[PDB]
Design a protein around this ligand. Structure first.
Ligand SMILES: [Mg+2]
Ligand SMILES: [Mg+2]
Ligand SMILES: [Mg+2]
Ligand SMILES: [Mg+2]
Ligand SMILES: [Mg+2]
Ligand SMILES: [Mg+2]
Ligand SMILES: [Mg+2]
Ligand SMILES: [Mg+2]
Ligand SMILES: [Mg+2]
Ligand SMILES: [Mg+2]
Ligand SMILES: [Mg+2]
Ligand SMILES: [Mg+2]
Ligand SMILES: [Mg+2]
Ligand SMILES: [Mg+2]
Ligand SMILES: [Mg+2]
Ligand SMILES: [Mg+2]
Ligand SMILES: [Mg+2]
Ligand SMILES: [Mg+2]
Ligand SMILES: [Mg+2]
Ligand SMILES: [Mg+2]
Ligand SMILES: [Mg+2]
Ligand SMILES: [Mg+2]
Ligand SMILES: [Mg+2]
Ligand SMILES: [Mg+2]
Ligand SMILES: [Mg+2]
Ligand SMILES: [Mg+2]
Ligand SMILES: [Mg+2]
Ligand SMILES: [Mg+2]
Ligand SMILES: [Mg+2]
Ligand SMILES: [Mg+2]
Ligand SMILES: [Mg+2]
Ligand SMILES: [Mg+2]
Ligand SMILES: [Mg+2]
Ligand SMILES: [Mg+2]
Ligand SMILES: [Mg+2]
Ligand SMILES: [Mg+2]
Ligand SMILES: [Mg+2]
Ligand SMILES: [Mg+2]
Ligand SMILES: [Mg+2]
Ligand SMILES: [Mg+2]
Ligand SMILES: [Mg+2]
Ligand SMILES: [Mg+2]
Ligand SMILES: [Mg+2]
Ligand SMILES: [Mg+2]
Ligand SMILES: [Mg+2]
Ligand SMILES: [Mg+2]
Ligand SMILES: [Mg+2]
Ligand SMILES: [Mg+2]
Ligand SMILES: [Mg+2]
Ligand SMILES: [Mg+2]
Ligand SMILES: [Mg+2]
Ligand SMILES: [Mg+2]
Ligand SMILES: [Mg+2]
Ligand SMILES: [Mg+2]
Ligand SMILES: [Mg+2]
Ligand SMILES: [Mg+2]
Ligand SMILES: [Mg+2]
Ligand SMILES: [Mg+2]
Ligand SMILES: [Mg+2]
Ligand SMILES: [Mg+2]
Ligand SMILES: [Mg+2]
Ligand SMILES: [Mg+2]
Ligand SMILES: [Mg+2]
Ligand SMILES: [Mg+2]
Ligand SMILES: [Mg+2]
Ligand SMILES: [Mg+2]
Ligand SMILES: [Mg+2]
Ligand SMILES: [Mg+2]
Ligand SMILES: [Mg+2]
Ligand SMILES: [Mg+2]
Ligand SMILES: [Mg+2]
Ligand SMILES: [Mg+2]
Ligand SMILES: [Mg+2]
Ligand SMILES: [Mg+2]
Ligand SMILES: [Mg+2]
Ligand SMILES: [Mg+2]
Ligand SMILES: [Mg+2]
Ligand SMILES: [Mg+2]
Ligand SMILES: [Mg+2]
Ligand SMILES: [Mg+2]
Ligand SMILES: [Mg+2]
Ligand SMILES: [Mg+2]
Ligand SMILES: [Mg+2]
Ligand SMILES: [Mg+2]
Ligand SMILES: [Mg+2]
Ligand SMILES: [Mg+2]
Ligand SMILES: [Mg+2]
Ligand SMILES: [Mg+2]
Ligand SMILES: [Mg+2]
Ligand SMILES: [Mg+2]
Ligand SMILES: [Mg+2]
Ligand SMILES: [Mg+2]
Ligand SMILES: [Mg+2]
Ligand SMILES: [Mg+2]
Ligand SMILES: [Mg+2]
Ligand SMILES: [Mg+2]
Ligand SMILES: [Mg+2]
Ligand SMILES: [Mg+2]
Ligand SMILES: [Mg+2]
Ligand SMILES: [Mg+2]
Ligand SMILES: [Mg+2]
Ligand SMILES: [Mg+2]
Ligand SMILES: [Mg+2]
Ligand SMILES: [Mg+2]
Ligand SMILES: [Mg+2]
Ligand SMILES: [Mg+2]
Ligand SMILES: [Mg+2]
Ligand SMILES: [Mg+2]
Ligand SMILES: [Mg+2]
Ligand SMILES: [Mg+2]
Ligand SMILES: [Mg+2]
Ligand SMILES: [Mg+2]
Ligand SMILES: [Mg+2]
Ligand SMILES: [Mg+2]
Ligand SMILES: [Mg+2]
Ligand SMILES: [Mg+2]
Ligand SMILES: [Mg+2]
Ligand SMILES: [Mg+2]
Ligand SMILES: [Mg+2]
Ligand SMILES: [Mg+2]
Ligand SMILES: [Mg+2]
Ligand SMILES: [Mg+2]
Ligand SMILES: [Mg+2]
Ligand SMILES: [Mg+2]
Ligand SMILES: [Mg+2]
Ligand SMILES: [Mg+2]
Ligand SMILES: [Mg+2]
Ligand SMILES: [Mg+2]
Ligand SMILES: [Mg+2]
Ligand SMILES: [Mg+2]
Ligand SMILES: [Mg+2]
Ligand SMILES: [Mg+2]
Ligand SMILES: [Mg+2]
Ligand SMILES: [Mg+2]
Ligand SMILES: [Mg+2]
Ligand SMILES: [Mg+2]
Ligand SMILES: [Mg+2]
Ligand SMILES: [Mg+2]
Ligand SMILES: [Mg+2]
Ligand SMILES: [Mg+2]
Ligand SMILES: [Mg+2]
Ligand SMILES: [Mg+2]
Ligand SMILES: [Mg+2]
Ligand SMILES: [Mg+2]
Ligand SMILES: [Mg+2]
Ligand SMILES: [Mg+2]
Ligand SMILES: [Mg+2]
Ligand SMILES: [Mg+2]
Ligand SMILES: [Mg+2]
Ligand SMILES: [Mg+2]
Ligand SMILES: [Mg+2]
Ligand SMILES: [Mg+2]
Ligand SMILES: [Mg+2]
Ligand SMILES: [Mg+2]
Ligand SMILES: [Mg+2]
Ligand SMILES: [Mg+2]
Ligand SMILES: [Mg+2]
Ligand SMILES: [Mg+2]
Ligand SMILES: [Mg+2]
Ligand SMILES: [Mg+2]
Ligand SMILES: [Mg+2]
Ligand SMILES: [Mg+2]
Ligand SMILES: [Mg+2]
Ligand SMILES: [Mg+2]
Ligand SMILES: [Mg+2]
Ligand SMILES: [Mg+2]
Ligand SMILES: [Mg+2]
Ligand SMILES: [Mg+2]
Ligand SMILES: [Mg+2]
Ligand SMILES: [Mg+2]
Ligand SMILES: [Mg+2]
Ligand SMILES: [Mg+2]
Ligand SMILES: [Mg+2]
Ligand SMILES: [Mg+2]
Ligand SMILES: [Mg+2]
Ligand SMILES: [Mg+2]
Ligand SMILES: [Mg+2]
Ligand SMILES: [Mg+2]
Ligand SMILES: [Mg+2]
Ligand SMILES: [Mg+2]
Ligand SMILES: [Mg+2]
Ligand SMILES: [Mg+2]
Ligand SMILES: [Mg+2]
Ligand SMILES: [Mg+2]
Ligand SMILES: [Mg+2]
Ligand SMILES: [Mg+2]
Ligand SMILES: [Mg+2]
Ligand SMILES: [Mg+2]
Ligand SMILES: [Mg+2]
Ligand SMILES: [Mg+2]
Ligand SMILES: [Mg+2]
Ligand SMILES: [Mg+2]
Ligand SMILES: [Mg+2]
Ligand SMILES: [Mg+2]
Ligand SMILES: [Mg+2]
Ligand SMILES: [Mg+2]
Ligand SMILES: [Mg+2]
Ligand SMILES: [Mg+2]
Ligand SMILES: [Mg+2]
Ligand SMILES: [Mg+2]
Ligand SMILES: [Mg+2]
Ligand SMILES: [Mg+2]
Ligand SMILES: [Mg+2]
Ligand SMILES: [Mg+2]
Ligand SMILES: [Mg+2]
Ligand SMILES: [Mg+2]
Ligand SMILES: [Mg+2]
Ligand SMILES: [Mg+2]
Ligand SMILES: [Mg+2]
Ligand SMILES: [Mg+2]
Ligand SMILES: [Mg+2]
Ligand SMILES: [Mg+2]
Ligand SMILES: [Mg+2]
Ligand SMILES: [Mg+2]
Ligand SMILES: [Mg+2]
Ligand SMILES: [Mg+2]
Ligand SMILES: [Mg+2]
Ligand SMILES: [Mg+2]
Ligand SMILES: [Mg+2]
Ligand SMILES: [Mg+2]
Ligand SMILES: [Mg+2]
Ligand SMILES: [Mg+2]
Ligand SMILES: [Mg+2]
Ligand SMILES: [Mg+2]
Ligand SMILES: [Mg+2]
Ligand SMILES: [Mg+2]
Ligand SMILES: [Mg+2]
Ligand SMILES: [Mg+2]
Ligand SMILES: [Mg+2]
Ligand SMILES: [Mg+2]
Ligand SMILES: [Mg+2]
Ligand SMILES: [Mg+2]
Ligand SMILES: [Zn+2]
Lengths: 59, 118, 204, 122, 131
RNA sequence: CGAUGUCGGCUCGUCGCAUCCUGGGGCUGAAGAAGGUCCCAAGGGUUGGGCUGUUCGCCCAUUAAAGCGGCACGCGAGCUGGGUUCAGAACGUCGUGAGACAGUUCGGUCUCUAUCCGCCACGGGCGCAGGAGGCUUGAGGGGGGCUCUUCCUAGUACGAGAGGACCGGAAGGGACGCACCUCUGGUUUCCCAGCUGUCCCUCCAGGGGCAUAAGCUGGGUAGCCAUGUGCGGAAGGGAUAACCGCUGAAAGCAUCUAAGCGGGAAGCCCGCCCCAAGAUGAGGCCUCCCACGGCAGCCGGUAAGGACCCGGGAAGACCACCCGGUGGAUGGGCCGGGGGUGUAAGCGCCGCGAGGCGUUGAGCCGACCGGUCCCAAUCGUCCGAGGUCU
RNA sequence: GAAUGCCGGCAUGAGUAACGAUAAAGAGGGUGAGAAUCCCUCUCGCCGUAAGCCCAAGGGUUCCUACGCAAUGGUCGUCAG
RNA sequence: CGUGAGGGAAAGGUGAAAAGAACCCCGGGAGGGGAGUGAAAUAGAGCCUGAAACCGUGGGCUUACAAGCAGUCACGGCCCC
């Protein structure tokens, strides 16, 4: 190879346009049916340790 | 292509991956429940379930087969005397994986519990 | 034209006049007529076939109304056969008889991101004599200042397969109506389990 | 499955012992010769005082191959060597006897005399 | 649906059951139907079976023999209609499924390596004492 | 000249036509067969070797043919580095010498990261006046386009003979292309077995690690594959080229042409296969939802639907696509079958012993074809029409 | 306003290459505001003419213990030259 | 920095006065919010003034059929005085 290099500085517009797909998407959260805490679905609740309606975990 | 290929690789060569499964089995069979990454948890099910099933058969041959992976005679003895008889009527499904809510801080890894079923 | 929708089940071979005959087995019918395309209504002629029954608890409301207007139970797949107006309300393997030739359309197996050697049978590069990290590379992709660009349609690495492919003029070796089974001599695109379309051949 | 550079045993009594295919006589650019195909070959080894000698450029028909031959009945046949019989421009054998078995494909390709001269046809 | 059962169903018209069970290392005589012009005859191929390649109806087996100084191998579909009959000429006992290694052995070394399978030879004698 | 890397090769093509072959023709000092010469024709095709850095060329063996040129003597941010083209060394030769030679000879550092255009693939956004779930039309693109032999007609027409057709018909090939894995043949990183050395468990027996990122060796399912299997080039229609005509004046004859009509190419248009409505010219059909509250606008709750999350997938870099989510067989286990390996351990018996025989096609056993709710897809959340105007 | 000018500041490339031998990890327990990364136990792997031990150069407090984590450590850090 | 001869930097400013922010609140701390001091605290010690490049939050106009040395001339739409 022969060391490719940028030909022109990237403009503010083109830099920020490239970044138009970078925004985070918020985390998916459901209420825990036992303690009403907001938590990812399909995880053992980190606030009360219940899952599938029963205590799985000391928290 | 990976078409219809079975079994994770876990970025380990042959002997390391086999030693990973053996070591996790000893740990799970010892404590009843462990925490790993979700991918490791899922692959550990089939490995342990097979050892538990051979324990249920109970013969000398089964014990010698199990010993190839577990090596600890006192632990195989625990597997045959205590662990296996509480699964006499259970046909498969001797382990369960439940995903944990919080990721590991240093690398974001999703975690899961693996345990023996009641 | 005449056609039917099907599932590719697998390959084997039968013996016919002391010859081994490679066959692909297709589970073709039966296919209810769910809609007819007419020149007055739709501007052309074809029959929308249905295939494989579905759990209604999975069929949403606009689809349910479409089946109900046809008086047909909920089906997994709708596909049209162009220029085909079957007389009955159901197309089965019996539209084909042994000795006929058919065109079979499937979705080919997917190579994913394929190199230029798998996709286009490029020769690649030498594996010794100083060859330097270009063993599977395409080589040159053009000229110089004229034209100073790369042609459209240049053959390059990229996704390969999982596309519609039609193999033409296949011999129907047997029909087993009791099991809605079609035996076609030769190879048919896609995996076992894949949806295929079997049409009367366009080759004379 | 024979191509230029391939060595073949000589299944006849022409005097030649080893020939080296230099051409597959099967069109513009055939890649391989099988049983029943004709090759041009150089004679690389011959016994003293035979009809053919070393350095002769001869034609021969491939009579058996190490690459197994497929048949429409679903079966196949495979020999331990790559063997040829040296022929003239009329496809006739130049020797008077052929050694070892020969493929039955030869018969269908018009080498009747070689088929009969053989001890076994498989 | 059961795609495997459907395939087995298509093959069912062609499966045969008249042929005798054999193992790699056995010596076998295959009576095989052959065309030649302007007739069709039965040619016997007799040799050691060095491979049984199993796939249900698509099982095939390979028989090796030396003919007139040259080794020959034939692959036969185990359910070919062109097989008239198979005769067990000798039971050999091997220690492995594939006997490719005998392609490199002298005939003496083969006789040493594939000795007669007494257990199965007696089994063939006991049977065939039919009523 | 604050650098436009320079021969040849390899790879990858694409174009011109002054055409090497294949298709169509006129003339022939064209009997036939085979040639010669010119015209039309660029759709496809145009082999493998020996020599030399070679381009070129010669030679060998074939071929329908082994075409000639352009693209920075196409292509070194694609590779090579034989040549050429620094520093070393030598020969011939020139020069008193230092040194010199498109003369020769041996050797001699070819730079991981692509910003923009371009190209190959894949998404996200918004649009397509109501919002949705399907199924589609095909404007316009692309892909493909090759050819040989044998046989019949017929040893006929033609020819003294040798030789040997048109037209029409049949079979078999080569290379190339697409797909596939039943068969043939590969691989198959742990599916099975055998083996050595060493260390260990537990002394025997039985096993485990390591000897590679499989210690070695003999095998090997699914998958992915070619060497294996199927299928393709068309047919057919339309308009033409060169060329050949019909009728026919100007020009009482003649003339394919000035009016008019016909025949006629592997080439052109269509036909086949694939993409395709961002075709903003945003298409069509079937079906579903509805005119909801508060102030071509806004605010919130809903509708048909959809997304999230999860189990996964011959789908896949992410994404996307597809299937499933307890009203469930989606993965995992377990069971049966297939498949591989090829007779486990233990015990009995024979041998002083290494071992052997029996139990036993046993034991082990990935992916393949299925079964089974044992394990896990719990529980849920958030979006989403109220239909501008003539 | 330019001198491939000088000094300084701050951009672009870009959330990109990389994070320095492919000897390799797993779990449980503890500490802590915080743990893949610190301590402890068990399992696994690697070196063993060394990747173990002693000495001479050179280096110059890096040694031991307590307390601590802003910076240094290619991540993290409760640990540490 | 260099074995050495030798080379050789950068770096000034709270306020009149430390009156240098007790005490409370979130935080492990860092940092901040109140309180308080001061004529002044975007004079709070990373301190006079505090330009420019460069980065960000809010608002007005505008932009997803479009060909561009990016301006200029014209007209029209919207927003503001
Ligand atoms: Mg390079
Ligand atoms: Mg380069
Ligand atoms: Mg580069
Ligand atoms: Mg390089
Ligand atoms: Mg670079
Ligand atoms: Mg540049
Ligand atoms: Mg901006
Ligand atoms: Mg950009
Ligand atoms: Mg708490
Ligand atoms: Mg794929
Ligand atoms: Mg791979
Ligand atoms: Mg799976
Ligand atoms: Mg996998
Ligand atoms: Mg594995
Ligand atoms: Mg791996
Ligand atoms: Mg990794
Ligand atoms: Mg690792
Ligand atoms: Mg290892
Ligand atoms: Mg190893
Ligand atoms: Mg996954
Ligand atoms: Mg879970
Ligand atoms: Mg999570
Ligand atoms: Mg951490
Ligand atoms: Mg399809
Ligand atoms: Mg490639
Ligand atoms: Mg390839
Ligand atoms: Mg391809
Ligand atoms: Mg190549
Ligand atoms: Mg290659
Ligand atoms: Mg090479
Ligand atoms: Mg190199
Ligand atoms: Mg290099
Ligand atoms: Mg290399
Ligand atoms: Mg390249
Ligand atoms: Mg240009
Ligand atoms: Mg795709
Ligand atoms: Mg039949
Ligand atoms: Mg398949
Ligand atoms: Mg000589
Ligand atoms: Mg011989
Ligand atoms: Mg099958
Ligand atoms: Mg069935
Ligand atoms: Mg015979
Ligand atoms: Mg024999
Ligand atoms: Mg018969
Ligand atoms: Mg210059
Ligand atoms: Mg410059
Ligand atoms: Mg310049
Ligand atoms: Mg330069
Ligand atoms: Mg060219
Ligand atoms: Mg011309
Ligand atoms: Mg020509
Ligand atoms: Mg011609
Ligand atoms: Mg003539
Ligand atoms: Mg003549
Ligand atoms: Mg002519
Ligand atoms: Mg002419
Ligand atoms: Mg002319
Ligand atoms: Mg052409
Ligand atoms: Mg062209
Ligand atoms: Mg050309
Ligand atoms: Mg050549
Ligand atoms: Mg050479
Ligand atoms: Mg040579
Ligand atoms: Mg050469
Ligand atoms: Mg040359
Ligand atoms: Mg020359
Ligand atoms: Mg010459
Ligand atoms: Mg010729
Ligand atoms: Mg010719
Ligand atoms: Mg040129
Ligand atoms: Mg140039
Ligand atoms: Mg020139
Ligand atoms: Mg020149
Ligand atoms: Mg050039
Ligand atoms: Mg050239
Ligand atoms: Mg070049
Ligand atoms: Mg280069
Ligand atoms: Mg070059
Ligand atoms: Mg270049
Ligand atoms: Mg360059
Ligand atoms: Mg380049
Ligand atoms: Mg360049
Ligand atoms: Mg050189
Ligand atoms: Mg040289
Ligand atoms: Mg030279
Ligand atoms: Mg020189
Ligand atoms: Mg120099
Ligand atoms: Mg030099
Ligand atoms: Mg010299
Ligand atoms: Mg001299
Ligand atoms: Mg001179
Ligand atoms: Mg001179
Ligand atoms: Mg002189
Ligand atoms: Mg002199
Ligand atoms: Mg000079
Ligand atoms: Mg010189
Ligand atoms: Mg020169
Ligand atoms: Mg010179
Ligand atoms: Mg010289
Ligand atoms: Mg050298
Ligand atoms: Mg040189
Ligand atoms: Mg560089
Ligand atoms: Mg980079
Ligand atoms: Mg780029
Ligand atoms: Mg540009
Ligand atoms: Mg889109
Ligand atoms: Mg989108
Ligand atoms: Mg329409
Ligand atoms: Mg079109
Ligand atoms: Mg367009
Ligand atoms: Mg076209
Ligand atoms: Mg005749
Ligand atoms: Mg005559
Ligand atoms: Mg003809
Ligand atoms: Mg053909
Ligand atoms: Mg298979
Ligand atoms: Mg295979
Ligand atoms: Mg097979
Ligand atoms: Mg095989
Ligand atoms: Mg194993
Ligand atoms: Mg050992
Ligand atoms: Mg010991
Ligand atoms: Mg011990
Ligand atoms: Mg022992
Ligand atoms: Mg060890
Ligand atoms: Mg190792
Ligand atoms: Mg091993
Ligand atoms: Mg060995
Ligand atoms: Mg093998
Ligand atoms: Mg192996
Ligand atoms: Mg396989
Ligand atoms: Mg092939
Ligand atoms: Mg016409
Ligand atoms: Mg006149
Ligand atoms: Mg006239
Ligand atoms: Mg006219
Ligand atoms: Mg006409
Ligand atoms: Mg005409
Ligand atoms: Mg005419
Ligand atoms: Mg035509
Ligand atoms: Mg053609
Ligand atoms: Mg389409
Ligand atoms: Mg549309
Ligand atoms: Mg469409
Ligand atoms: Mg347009
Ligand atoms: Mg539409
Ligand atoms: Mg809903
Ligand atoms: Mg996935
Ligand atoms: Mg992602
Ligand atoms: Mg869908
Ligand atoms: Mg769904
Ligand atoms: Mg649900
Ligand atoms: Mg439910
Ligand atoms: Mg399931
Ligand atoms: Mg299952
Ligand atoms: Mg199973
Ligand atoms: Mg079985
Ligand atoms: Mg079996
Ligand atoms: Mg035994
Ligand atoms: Mg035993
Ligand atoms: Mg004894
Ligand atoms: Mg005994
Ligand atoms: Mg089984
Ligand atoms: Mg299993
Ligand atoms: Mg359940
Ligand atoms: Mg059920
Ligand atoms: Mg919930
Ligand atoms: Mg100036
Ligand atoms: Mg500069
Ligand atoms: Mg500069
Ligand atoms: Mg400067
Ligand atoms: Mg300046
Ligand atoms: Mg400066
Ligand atoms: Mg600067
Ligand atoms: Mg920057
Ligand atoms: Mg910078
Ligand atoms: Mg990224
Ligand atoms: Mg980049
Ligand atoms: Mg990257
Ligand atoms: Mg670095
Ligand atoms: Mg990286
Ligand atoms: Mg590195
Ligand atoms: Mg590293
Ligand atoms: Mg811990
Ligand atoms: Mg802990
Ligand atoms: Mg830590
Ligand atoms: Mg921490
Ligand atoms: Mg520790
Ligand atoms: Mg070691
Ligand atoms: Mg030692
Ligand atoms: Mg000292
Ligand atoms: Mg120091
Ligand atoms: Mg000390
Ligand atoms: Mg200290
Ligand atoms: Mg210390
Ligand atoms: Mg401490
Ligand atoms: Mg620190
Ligand atoms: Mg820190
Ligand atoms: Mg910190
Ligand atoms: Mg401090
Ligand atoms: Mg640091
Ligand atoms: Mg740090
Ligand atoms: Mg570092
Ligand atoms: Mg602390
Ligand atoms: Mg430290
Ligand atoms: Mg110095
Ligand atoms: Mg110093
Ligand atoms: Mg100095
Ligand atoms: Mg200063
Ligand atoms: Mg002061
Ligand atoms: Mg002051
Ligand atoms: Mg405080
Ligand atoms: Mg605090
Ligand atoms: Mg606090
Ligand atoms: Mg403070
Ligand atoms: Mg605060
Ligand atoms: Mg404060
Ligand atoms: Mg105050
Ligand atoms: Mg004042
Ligand atoms: Mg101020
Ligand atoms: Mg101030
Ligand atoms: Mg002042
Ligand atoms: Mg200030
Ligand atoms: Mg400031
Ligand atoms: Mg500023
Ligand atoms: Mg800015
Ligand atoms: Mg803004
Ligand atoms: Mg437009
Ligand atoms: Mg617009
Ligand atoms: Mg303007
Ligand atoms: Mg105006
Ligand atoms: Zn909870």
């Amino acid at each position: 190879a022969k060391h490719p290099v940028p030909k022109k500085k990237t403009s503010k517009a083109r830099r920020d346009a490239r970044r138009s797909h970078h925004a985070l998407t918020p985390p998916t959260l459901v209420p825990c049916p036992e303690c009403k805490a907001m938590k990812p679905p399909h995880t053992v609740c980190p606030e009360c340790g219940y899952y599938a309606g029963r205590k799985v975990l000391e928290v | 292509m990976r078409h219809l290929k079975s079994g994770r690789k876990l970025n380990r060569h042959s002997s390391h991956r086999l030693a990973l499964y053996r070591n996790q089995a000893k740990s799970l069979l010892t404590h009843g429940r462990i925490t790993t990454t979700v991918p490791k948890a899922k692959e550990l099910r089939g490995f342990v379930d097979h050892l538990i099933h051979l324990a249920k058969r109970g013969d000398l041959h089964a014990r010698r087969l199990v010993l190839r992976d577990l090596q600890d005679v006192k632990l195989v003895r625990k597997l045959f005397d205590e662990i296996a008889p509480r699964y006499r009527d259970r046909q498969g499904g001797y382990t369960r994986v439940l995903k944990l809510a919080e990721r590991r801080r240093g690398d974001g890894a999703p975690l899961a519990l693996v345990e023996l079923v009641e | 034209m005449k056609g039917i929708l099907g599932v590719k089940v697998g390959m084997t071979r039968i013996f016919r006049d002391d010859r081994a005959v490679p066959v692909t087995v297709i589970l073709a019918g039966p296919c209810p007529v769910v809609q007819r395309r007419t020149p007055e209504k739709d501007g052309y002629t074809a029959v929308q076939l249905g295939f494989l029954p579905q759990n209604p608890k999975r069929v949403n409301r606009p689809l349910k109304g479409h089946f109900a207007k046809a008086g047909v139970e909920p089906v997994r797949i709708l596909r049209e056969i162009r220029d085909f107006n079957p007389e009955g309300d159901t197309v089965t393997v019996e539209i084909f008889k042994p000795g006929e030739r058919v065109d079979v359309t499937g979705t080919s197996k997917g190579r994913g991101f394929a190199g230029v050697m798998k996709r286009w049978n490029f020769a690649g590069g030498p594996d010794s004599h100083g060859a330097h990290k270009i063993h599977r590379h395409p080589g040159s992709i053009g000229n110089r200042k004229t034209p100073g660009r790369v042609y459209k349609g240049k053959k390059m690495a990229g996704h390969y397969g999982a596309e519609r492919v039609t193999v033409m003029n296949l011999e129907v070796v047997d029909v087993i109506p009791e099991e809605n089974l079609l035996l076609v001599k030769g190879a048919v695109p896609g995996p076992n389990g894949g949806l295929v379309i079997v049409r009367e051949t366009k080759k004379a | 499955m024979i191509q230029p550079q391939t060595y073949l045993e000589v299944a006849d009594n022409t005097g030649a012992r080893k020939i080296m295919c230099i051409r597959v006589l099967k069109g513009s650019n055939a890649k391989y010769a099988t049983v029943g195909d004709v090759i041009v070959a150089s004679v690389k080894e011959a016994i003293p005082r035979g009809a053919v000698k070393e350095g002769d450029v001869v034609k021969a028909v491939v009579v058996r191959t190490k690459k197994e031959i497929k048949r429409p009945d679903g079966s196949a046949i495979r020999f331990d060597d790559n063997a040829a019989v040296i022929i003239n421009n009329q496809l006739e054998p130049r020797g008077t006897r052929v050694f070892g078995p020969v493929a039955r494909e030869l018969r269908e390709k018009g080498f009747m005399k070689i088929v009969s001269l053989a001890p076994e046809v498989l | 649906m059961n795609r495997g059962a459907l395939i087995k169903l298509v093959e069912s018209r062609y499966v045969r059951t008249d042929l005798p069970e054999f193992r790699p290392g056995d010596t076998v005589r295959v009576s095989y139907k052959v065309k030649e012009g302007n007739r069709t005859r039965i040619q016997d191929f007799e040799g050691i079976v060095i491979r049984i390649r199993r796939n249900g109806f698509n099982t095939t087996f390979t028989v090796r023999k030396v003919s007139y100084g040259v080794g020959v191998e034939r692959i036969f579909p185990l359910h070919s209609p062109l097989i008239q009959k198979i005769d067990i000429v000798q039971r050999g006992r091997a220690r492995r499924a594939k006997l490719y290694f005998i392609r490199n052995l002298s005939d003496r070394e083969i006789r040493r390596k594939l000795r007669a399978d007494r257990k199965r030879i007696d089994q063939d004698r006991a049977a065939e004492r039919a009523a």
